Amino acid sequence: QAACPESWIGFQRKCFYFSDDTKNWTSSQRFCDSQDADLAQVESFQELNFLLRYKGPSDHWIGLSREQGQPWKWIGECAYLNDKGASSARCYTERKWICSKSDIHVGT
Numbered sequence: 001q002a003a004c005p006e007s008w009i010g011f012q013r014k015c016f017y018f019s020d021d022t023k024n025w026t027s028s029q030r031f032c033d034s035q036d037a038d039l040a041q042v043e044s045f046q047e048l049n050f051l052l053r054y055k056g057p058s059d060h061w062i063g064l065s066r067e068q069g070q071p072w073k074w075i076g077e078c079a080y081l082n083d084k085g086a087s088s089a090r091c092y093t094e095r096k097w098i099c100s101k102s103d104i105h106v107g108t
């Protein structure tokens with residue numbers, strides 16, 4: 001059994017932080033790096049669906065990016081979630097973001 005910090009939201013073993021403000025992709029990653037977290041690393045389809053359902057009507061950066069000629073990689077272009085799925089934009093644009101981290105295990 002497990003918990004998330006109070007401003008974060010839990011979904012199966014992970015915690016996610018949905019931002020108030022907008023940043024570019026690198027400055028969102030810097031922000032998440034502070035929480036010893038990362039721009040959201042979506043490990044499963046169920047997790048993607050969760051973020052799509054929870055996120056609200058704004059675009060949100062996730063931790064997926066691409067150097068030109070090269071494939072998309074999880075932590076050029078950067079990916080965000082819109083209402084239907086993922087899309088790309090230049091990394092200098094300003095969007096809300098999602099951080100992810102493993103949840104806090106509460107030992108017994």
Ligand SMILES: *[C@@H]1O[C@H](CO)[C@@H](O)[C@H](O)[C@H]1NC(C)=O
Pocket residue numbers: 024026027091092
């Ligand atoms: C993102 O914006 C920040 C301002 O917080 C700036 O320091 C950084 O260089 C920017 N990165 C870009 C424009 O790619």
